[PDB]
Amino acid sequence: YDIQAWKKQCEELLNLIFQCEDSEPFRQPVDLLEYPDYRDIIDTPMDFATVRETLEAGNYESPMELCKDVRLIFSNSKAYTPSKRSRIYSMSLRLSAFFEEHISSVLSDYKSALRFHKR
Ligand SMILES: CCn1cc(NC(=O)C2CCC2)cn1
Incomplete structure (x- = not known):
C-alpha cells in the first residue's frame, strides 16, 4: 500500500536496464x-538517460508516466x-520484453496502493 514505492523500484529497474547489453543503443x-x-521521422526523441534524469529530478508523478x-x-x-530484422531494432524488442516483464508489478502495486488510499 506504499504510494511512493514505485520510485525506487523504477530506479532499480533502470539500473538493470543499464547493465543489459541490449540497452547500449538507447542509453543516450x-x-x-x-x-x-532521424528528426524527419521521429517527433519526440527519448532515451534511458533522459528517463533516469526525469525520475531523479522528481519530474515523474507516477510509474505510468515513466512507462x-x-x-x-x-x-x-x-x-x-529500416527493417524489422535490423540489429538495433532487434535489441529494442528484447529490451522491451524485459522491461514489460518487470514494470508490470510496479504498475499493479502503485495502482492498488492508490485505490487503497482513496478507499
Ligand atoms: C538506429 C538509430 N539509433 C541510434 C541509436 N543510438 C545512438 O545513436 C547512440 C549514440 C549514443 C546513443 C539508437 N538507435
Missing part, C-alpha cells in the same frame, strides 16, 4: 550526426528501423 539520445534524417517514456524509446526504434 540518438546521434543526429550518424543518423541525419510512457520508456515505451516511446521502443516505438521510436520501431518507427526509425
Whole structure:
C-alpha cells in the first residue's frame, strides 16, 4: 500500500536496464550526426538517460508516466528501423520484453496502493 514505492523500484529497474547489453543503443539520445534524417521521422526523441534524469529530478508523478517514456524509446526504434530484422531494432524488442516483464508489478502495486488510499 506504499504510494511512493514505485520510485525506487523504477530506479532499480533502470539500473538493470543499464547493465543489459541490449540497452547500449538507447542509453543516450540518438546521434543526429550518424543518423541525419532521424528528426524527419521521429517527433519526440527519448532515451534511458533522459528517463533516469526525469525520475531523479522528481519530474515523474507516477510509474505510468515513466512507462510512457520508456515505451516511446521502443516505438521510436520501431518507427526509425529500416527493417524489422535490423540489429538495433532487434535489441529494442528484447529490451522491451524485459522491461514489460518487470514494470508490470510496479504498475499493479502503485495502482492498488492508490485505490487503497482513496478507499
Ligand atoms: C538506429 C538509430 N539509433 C541510434 C541509436 N543510438 C545512438 O545513436 C547512440 C549514440 C549514443 C546513443 C539508437 N538507435
